[PDB]
Structures are given as structure tokens and as C-alpha cells.
Paper text:
Upon imposing crystal symmetry, it is apparent that each monomer contacts a symmetry-related molecule in precisely the same manner as chains A and B of the full-length DgcB structure (mediated through D56). It was not possible to assign the tail as originating from a specific chain (chain B, C and D FHA domains are all close enough to span the distance to the bound tail). The FHA cleft makes three hydrogen bonds to the tail (involving R61, T96 and N97), which binds in a linear conformation across the apical face of the FHA fold.
The DgcB protein appends the C-terminal GGDEF enzymatic domain with an N-terminal forkhead-associated (FHA) domain, known to be used (in other proteins) for interactions with phosphopeptide ligands. DgcB comprised a ~30aa tail, 100aa FHA, 20aa linker and 160aa GGDEF domain. We provide the molecular basis for initiation of c-di-GMP production, demonstrating that the stimulus is a phosphopeptide tail present on the DgcB GGDEF synthase itself.
Numbering used by the authors: 13 to 19
The structure:
């Protein structure tokens, strides 16, 4: 699965 970026 794809990482979630920092927001």
C-alpha cells in the first residue's frame, strides 16, 4: 500500500 504524506 501507498504511504500517506505528512500534512
Amino acid at each position: 500500500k501507498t504511504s500517506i504524506v505528512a500534512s
